[PDB]
Design a protein around this nucleic acid. Structure first.
Lengths: 97, 83, 77, 105, 95, 98, 83, 96, 103
DNA sequence: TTTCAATACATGCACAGGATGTATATATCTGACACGTGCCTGGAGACTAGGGAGTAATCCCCTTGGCGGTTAAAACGCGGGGGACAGCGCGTACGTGCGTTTAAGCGGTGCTAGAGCTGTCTACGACCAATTGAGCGGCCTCGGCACCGGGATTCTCCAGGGCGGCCGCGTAAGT
DNA sequence: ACTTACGCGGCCGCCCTGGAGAATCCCGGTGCCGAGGCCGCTCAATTGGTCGTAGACAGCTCTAGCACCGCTTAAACGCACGTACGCGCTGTCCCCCGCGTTTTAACCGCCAAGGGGATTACTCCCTAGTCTCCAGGCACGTGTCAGATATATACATCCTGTGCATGTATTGAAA
């Protein structure tokens, strides 16, 4: 057969995802999660697709920023693989706690 | 009725693609659960305010203006909707 | 003296005998001494590890390191 | 010449801006010269942003402007990035950046 | 019939045609431009009202607007904006 | 004589400075620095003591926060002594630096 | 007249005491110069705005209200001066 | 000559004496309290005006103030504040 | 006075005048200042309770800004509400790192 | 004169004890800022006219929530192997700690005049109204642009064959 | 008859040539989105009056600011050495990559009706004005909490003394 070293397809996929702007998280699970969380405040409520799209975009942007900060912290920590401690330090320095 | 067994929607490949987009080469283990939790937290931090706006609008359907205002109050102005 | 190039094992034995310590001659110091007292190249310097391994397997060099960490080596007499 | 936009030589309306300033509950007494400065600055900034967007569109071999071009022009320029540092652009994405320590050797 | 709504598309189209005669725009970009215009509106109006309340005055003139523009903007862009206001205002005053 | 190990007086002085609220930076050098920086914008200006005190307090608070973040980054970096790279990373994560 | 040889006022013991208050045990070398520079930067970032307020007040003496407004606009509200 | 200025010290003194009968205050703490009262004033007024402009109305009543209080404050403190408004308002309504 | 009718210590007429003068709205009600003053008095009483507790714990008869800083930085609600606010003459909290202790 | 263990003996290691330089209330005293009192006043309070913003009942059809048949790409479970994560001996040089000597931070005093701050005159510019009308906004439309898809192409990354450094593999000539 | 002349012998490290799959450069025929034409009706335009906020001249006296003499204390120059930072090197187990297999996503077709949205009457609640008085505007003097402090005092930490397990030498016991 043909064996590949770790990191060959990873860089290609990273360069791939840095060119398109389509959504990665599916709409139905996110909508069901939003409907579940909305029941914790008030029952019998209705939502629209625009609000779901806005929430999904905001969550994706925040997660991308957090992952970028975590990768920066992991690179500064003389390592490559990210760890939850890097995410904790990132959210501690950001002030969100 | 409170719903459960829905936080597991954010599966492993979703977070893997998110890390690929963010620029991460390898992922550990507890991150999946932790990130998911934080996500839910932020979701609440928005949805609560949205519901409050709904209660201030005397309606039963959460429009996009309430979500836009809730996101703009938190210091994260999001365009592309134009009102 | 330093005429023809002797064997790597003999050079390592001489470098060990040149240094004196209570814990033993560290491998890095031995490599530096061989690099400074011989005309060996980079690939020839890379043979010091395998030559020390062969000398320890034979029994000429005793190892007093910490759980196999390439700490130091002494000459058994 | 009947409209003040033609008298001032601008494209943005002056009467609408004056009405918005007088009805937005900002001040009881509003002058008649401030909307001229306001509309002029607005037109200048809009023209600069449109110039940058058209440059990006011509560089991307595209005839029309998409939010991706706006995101690129904002994130590549220093002034627009400093002015819009706390603003998120929908359907924009991130900048193509690859880490140096992740490259093979 | 439909309720009447307002927008800022004709002016953006005229500016784009004055700059690039062969360049179009979509709907999402138009919404982004409208949101940006509304944001600048609110920011400049709030700065002017805050300066008027700080100076213990009750009239928003030209100097307050110029000061708000010079304060909100960094430097060079502010200066350019000031010029863009000044020239056009002179043309208005001679009219 | 009597020798002391590194870190004996440091902890005591740290616990000392975490109890008082007096100023550490002198007023005359800070005032002269403010007067120097003010000349880069407009000449012939006058200032008061309240503005100097406000600037000094704000600068001290910002420096204390930056040093705390730098110490946290240095502790996370498996080290003890802080480095300028920690300050750079702190200001990068804060968003103040490009 | 532009003044010089005044940035060296922030001496070594001052930064040492600041690090002791912040919780630092040992300091390096380039930090002194770097921190000092950043300090000056922030100083400008305030003083400029202060001078602008002075130019908007038609006065020659920078009062405390201008500095309070300049510090509050930057998102760092400082109390204790009630004005 | 002189000029007359306003302050909020008598009310703070009355509240402190109602809470702690044997406790004083200085001048810097009084200035801090005045600045905090002014900050709360401006924040609540801005929130009320923003809600009034969003709801397309032209009258700031009680429901808008209650919504602004419940939005600016996290949760429990908001609820308590609501009660503190409600009871006193009822006592006012039974008066006049 | 309306303050005696509502049972509060903060003034109602002054707050109503400030709300009508501050260029917020042309038509202002006569019940909103009651809620406002009530919430203000509640928050002020809570802050004064915390400050008096800190002063009694510090063996001091009067309240200093250090007590306010401690009460704000030790409590969760006041720290979350005043997260972007700097207190003059307050200082920091006495905290020592765990990895810096001798062993 | 040699075969084997005790023990006799010199190295790193765990625990109790001693000296000295620094944190910590404890009676005192003196000095200024906390706190109760007094007098003038402009902002707070009571009674009455007005109208248009605000509360509520009714009707229309836009759009969010339900569901059913259907094709398949993404979701899910197991294998094995290269190298990344983690524990460890060690080298010198860079920081603290405490010497000592010069300097500029800090405090009391005196004098001055630039411009912040208060009071007064009034006129250019702004608020409000009746009548006019043309620039700005909503529904049809079709057409020139890009979205989707089959095919040939040059770029970039992983794995394989040959050679040099010499060591024992073991023979012929030197001491 | 055995050691060094090296005869050859066979095993690890560095290079460039070599193949296959993924990224990359050109039409093809179709579609729905940017853009031009059209026509309706409310907000921008023209101009007379009356009014009160802002431009401007003048008298105070106050706080911004310049020269001076000692005084201890913070800043500064410089000897020493020990522990933290940094480079080198070994092992093992975990998350990278390819493949059999199953399930739930988007587009779609269609049936209902709810609370989103436009119309109107009439009324209780807010605005405007004159009159009027007591809460709160600030000068003043004094007096009580705590600033500064000298003499004992109990506690934290570096230095130094003391108990204990293993490899190996020498006189005794054994071959």
């Amino acid at each position: 057969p043909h064996r590949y070293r770790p990191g060959t397809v990873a860089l290609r996929e990273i360069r791939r995802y840095q060119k398109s702007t389509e959504l990665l998280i599916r709409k139905l699970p996110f909508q069901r999660l939003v409907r579940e969380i909305a029941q914790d405040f008030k029952t019998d409520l209705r939502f629209q697709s625009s609000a779901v799209m806005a929430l999904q975009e905001a969550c994706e942007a925040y997660l991308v920023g957090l992952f970028e900060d975590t990768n920066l912290c992991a690179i500064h920590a003389k390592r490559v693989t990210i760890m939850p401690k890097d995410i904790q330090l990132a959210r501690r320095i950001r002030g969100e706690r | 009725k409170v719903l459960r067994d829905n936080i597991q929607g954010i599966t492993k490949p979703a977070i893997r693609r998110l890390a690929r987009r963010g620029g991460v080469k390898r992922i550990s283990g507890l991150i999946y659960e932790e990130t998911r939790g934080v996500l839910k937290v932020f979701l609440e931090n928005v949805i609560r305010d949205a519901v409050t706006y709904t209660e201030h609008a005397k309606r039963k359907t959460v429009t996009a203006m309430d979500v836009v205002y809730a996101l703009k109050r938190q210091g994260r102005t999001l365009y592309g909707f134009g009102g | 003296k330093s005429t023809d190039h002797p064997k790597y094992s003999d050079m390592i034995v001489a470098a060990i005998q040149a240094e004196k310590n209570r814990a033993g001659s560290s491998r890095q110091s031995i490599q530096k001494y061989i690099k400074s007292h011989y005309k060996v190249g980079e690939n020839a310097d890379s043979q010091i590890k395998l030559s020390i391994k062969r000398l320890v397997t034979t029994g000429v060099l005793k190892q007093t390191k910490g759980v196999g960490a390439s700490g130091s080596f002494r000459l058994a007499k | 010449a009947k409209t003040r936009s033609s008298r001032a030589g601008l494209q943005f309306p002056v009467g609408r801006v004056h009405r918005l300033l007088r009805k937005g509950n900002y001040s009881e007494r509003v002058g008649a010269g401030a909307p001229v400065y306001l509309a002029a600055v607005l037109e200048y900034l809009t023209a600069e942003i449109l110039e940058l967007a058209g440059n990006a569109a011509r560089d991307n071999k595209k005839t029309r402007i998409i939010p991706r071009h706006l995101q690129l022009a904002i994130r590549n320029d220093e002034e627009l990035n400093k002015l819009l540092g706390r603003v998120t652009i929908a359907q924009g994405g991130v900048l193509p950046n690859i880490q140096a320590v992740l490259l093979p050797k | 019939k439909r309720s009447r709504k307002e927008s800022y598309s004709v002016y953006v189209y005229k500016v784009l045609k004055q700059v690039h005669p062969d360049t179009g725009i979509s709907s999402k970009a138009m919404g982004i431009m409208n949101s940006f215009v509304n944001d600048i509106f609110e920011r400049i109006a709030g700065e002017a009202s805050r300066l008027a309340h700080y100076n213990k005055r009750s009239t928003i003139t030209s100097r307050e607007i110029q000061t708000a523009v010079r304060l909100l903007l960094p430097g060079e862009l502010a200066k350019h904006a000031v010029s863009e206001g000044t020239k056009a205002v002179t043309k208005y005053t001679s009219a």
